Design a protein around this ligand. Sequence first.
Ligand SMILES: [Ca+2]
Ligand SMILES: [Mg+2]
Ligand SMILES: [Mg+2]
Lengths: 523, 529
Amino acid sequence: PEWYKSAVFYELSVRTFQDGNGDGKGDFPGLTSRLDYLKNLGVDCLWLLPWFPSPLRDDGYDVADYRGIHPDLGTLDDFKVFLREAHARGLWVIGDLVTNHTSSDHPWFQAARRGPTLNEYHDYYVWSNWTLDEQAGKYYWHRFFASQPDLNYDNPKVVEELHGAARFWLDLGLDGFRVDAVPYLIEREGTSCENLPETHEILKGFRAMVDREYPGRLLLAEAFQWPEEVVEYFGTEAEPEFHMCFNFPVMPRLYMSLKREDTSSIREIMGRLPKIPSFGQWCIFLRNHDELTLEMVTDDERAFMYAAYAPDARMKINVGIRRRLAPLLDNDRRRIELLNTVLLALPGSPVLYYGDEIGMGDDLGLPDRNGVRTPMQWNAGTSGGFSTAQPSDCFFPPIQDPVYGFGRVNVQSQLQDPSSLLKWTARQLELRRAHPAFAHGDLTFIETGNPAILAFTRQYDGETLLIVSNFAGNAQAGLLDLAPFVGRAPVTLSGASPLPVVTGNGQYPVVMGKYDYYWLRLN
Amino acid sequence: PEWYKSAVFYELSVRTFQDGNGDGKGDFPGLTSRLDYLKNLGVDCLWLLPWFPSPLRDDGYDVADYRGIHPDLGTLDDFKVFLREAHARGLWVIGDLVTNHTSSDHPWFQAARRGPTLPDGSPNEYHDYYVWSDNWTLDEQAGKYYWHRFFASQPDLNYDNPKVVEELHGAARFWLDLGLDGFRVDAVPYLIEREGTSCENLPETHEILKGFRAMVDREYPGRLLLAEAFQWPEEVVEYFGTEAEPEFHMCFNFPVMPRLYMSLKREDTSSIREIMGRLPKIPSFGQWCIFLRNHDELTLEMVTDDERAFMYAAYAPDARMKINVGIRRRLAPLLDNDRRRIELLNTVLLALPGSPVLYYGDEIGMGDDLGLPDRNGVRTPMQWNAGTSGGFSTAQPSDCFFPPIQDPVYGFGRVNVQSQLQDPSSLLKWTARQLELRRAHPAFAHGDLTFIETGNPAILAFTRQYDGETLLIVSNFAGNAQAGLLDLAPFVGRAPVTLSGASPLPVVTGNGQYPVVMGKYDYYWLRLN
Ligand SMILES: [Ca+2]
Ligand SMILES: [Mg+2]
Ligand SMILES: [Mg+2]
């Protein structure tokens, strides 16, 4: 019933998507001009990166106004037109609500740093991972960066200031937030300072507030933890909290399984997913604005990944690999389609990262995770059509290498190419939309004779989908245990071509080509 | 065995491959400068299109000198060095030998046009080089009709004159002595003409060809004579001659080609194994020559009228796309630029019995330019890089013999050699690697061909056997997953294994009916162990 359960999401950064005014930086007007593209792509909801005023010491997650638009993205009017036009086209939109902290440049903090009195803004933050404030002559607490002062959530004027910020955007029409850094909200003495029941209480209320005043809207938990730990942040039926949390550990295991030609680890994570509230939905993805993280893997698995996908030391950062999906898969369209299909056929709402629909590469010449944040590539024009501004003058430079450059990889080409990745992606999303079991159906892995072949069913409302996916780079054989479905014919979702009916014991033999995916219905 | 049997051929036009001097026209120096690319690609023999002096009224098949290089392609020296450099790299080269006629600009004919007698008195030996009388065009000079099968500027040579049969031998020898490895011999069915006869395949031409073949066997062993002769296989086999009296080493298997495309649209591979299965037997020395595309339109001459209409509807939706009795489009556009279909037809071409000819540019996925008149849209310049004219010339695009393609889909900015050399998954590297697989397995080149029963016409399956190697090749022609039950009864106890990773599949058992599923357009290349 709820929209976010069946939504395909699409993550972009306004600053990097389309420059509307020639200054080299993406902006809302420019984004507005590309809404038809996003519409026709088949995406349902745009998740925009932080659009708020900031000195950008932590990519604008250090917020210095919660009710503003960063000046070089346009104005609050631009934002309103963007949302009107987005909605006119059947698109939901969400943003990033940074709950735990602000930038040091927030008025609140500039007021707070002036002793206890001259001052109601002193007790918004936590005073005496502590830094000496020159002005106030005290230490302040910061969970994350010295320039990111953690908020005092024990002061309930702050809990209102949060609720207020949320309303500001929800009033304007915004369909949800991805809610950041929520585990670190309250802090006790001699304890974890994460996942504390008091912090959960605030979220339960925050939820119950939007449930009441703004039904339909979406709260999505950015909270980097295993499923078995974030289930907490869904709350309960009686006390709901977040509608959606991410399922992180699938992600690296898709890549790992491709290179191991062994899909065991996918089953291990997916099949052992905990139960969730009836209103809840998992959120999954292949790539995003950060590196491909390897935190939720063994050390030996992490070492395998590095050998497999980061041959160049430059490719490593933090605890992961800072490369785009296409370069990771050696620009192999077969592997690109494969993982995308598997992503789309698993339970959860998938998030697609801007540019991956057309096969974008990365720029390791750029510091610190910026190589996967280059400008979108629209045509073979001057800066990939991203700006009339020359490449040197764009926020990040548009990619021009012989393989992934905008002269070869761009939206216009793939709009005109009958067999482009772009059009493929759009069709596949359409296929997914035509079958509710993808979004709401259950998940049952099935026996293949072969770890390289992953097979599973998705069941809902008397529809049964059979998804078979070869993770090997050559022909594989399987014996699918389809005993439950004897007397049924697996039929091709694309084109309704029927396969042999399951008979006898229902051990169904198959061969598959390299990286093939079979999207089948059972009836 | 002989080299031509296991050879992969590569058809190029010197005038459009590489410009070496900035004039906007391809040439030998330019061609010579790209030999490494061709060597590394994994092709064996280059077939160069007509390179002779000519007024180009018939794309250079109207020859005006058999012992010359066309002035805007270089000099005869350029040619010799090209050939030396080609051989040093392990490449065989062949050229077109147009036997049946010359251009009207050929001095032989400019001499013959002066009647049987010269003005000083001398007897005009050159007059009896061509066929005169009283398809016939009147000459304002000689005051007589001359026989021409093809164009009024393509006067048929008179092959009853034994001086002419020598001129042919002479022309052949000139090139052979320079070291040329063979000819595609053009328009040979139409050599000799009689009364109340077809004027085609007359056993007198076969005499000249047996002679011509005897000449080359004796004086130049190893060289290749390939018959350009546009006929059905049962009818061309004549041109191989017999074991005792040979003629051509190779003939073209024309009908497979349109059927490959047709079967893909129909998702029915019947016509393929019909034609491939009812092929006539050929001499020990003989070999079939097979291909997907070439310098011409995709001809639909050797199919039924209904089959032709079907092909036009499927593959020439726009009327621009039609010409003569075919479709003037490149392979990649034909297949909607779908890499899966491109790889598939190529795999099948490479896996069938015959020596495959590959058309230049297809290895990178080049498109066509239908705004160019008359077949010129599939003869656009090779695309080397994203430089000024695809790297084909420093001359700007509009100054090139034909303009390099620049559309968003197939333009040289997106489709070019340099990009695909750096792309781990490019069509170029795919093509290179796939030839390596074919090279590594002699059953492809030399083995026999047995079709296998699948329960499903969309799944084409066959074996190739030679020297105790047995290859199973399974190919889905459908746009989606397809099931088959392969009759592998003979190979019970054998496990089919992957040519690529040496991945073994389930061992064949019982009755040997082997079930399979295939993805859209998949191809399985297997060894039976
Ligand atoms: Ca003749
Ligand atoms: Mg701007
Ligand atoms: Mg030149």
